[PDB]
């Protein structure tokens, strides 16, 4: 992090307590999901991290594969942004990442943080086996409990700005047990269909 005294800027290493608190706030959110993004967005604001700090934070929160995909995307976003013009970037003063580690280069650091943040958008979709696809209703699970069970896994797994209602509707079916799955040819029809698949199983005697 880069410290801002009340009365020059200086870098200080991450404190494990702060990293730990970030991971606990991210909770079960997958990289790119809303909770994940709000968390690391708040962290970048609070700690004004350098490029090196951001690399430590990445490896603490995400798997080694995810970290590599992030690096690939971030490199492309960097190249593209260089053409448009990066504030504080002297192409003759060495690699941009080295420059972003100079705590005096605030503008350049703030730009790098924003590209670092934006890079997470491309990460989902490269995960073809999310956990929310696995959540499946057992022969014993109630239906009303299962629909919420899927809602949270989608809340934690789906990237930002992605439809969830059309996902849960199919998932509340494709991932339901064969027990209650037989009430799904006369499925009720409403405006928000979700209210129906529950009406069908609003009362389900085992």
Residue numbers in the entry: 1 to 7, 9 to 207
Tell me what the authors wrote about this structure, in their words.
This results in a closer-packed lattice for HTLV, with a distance between hexamer centres of 74.6 Å, nearly 20 Å shorter than that of the HIV lattice (92.0 Å). While there is currently no equivalent structure available for the HTLV-1 mature CA lattice, the comparison strongly suggests that our HTLV-1c CA crystal structure packing most closely resembles the immature lattice.
Human T-cell Leukaemia Virus type 1 (HTLV-1) is an untreatable retrovirus that causes lethal malignancies and degenerative inflammatory conditions. Across the known Orthoretrovirinae, CA is a two-domain protein with HIV being the best characterised.
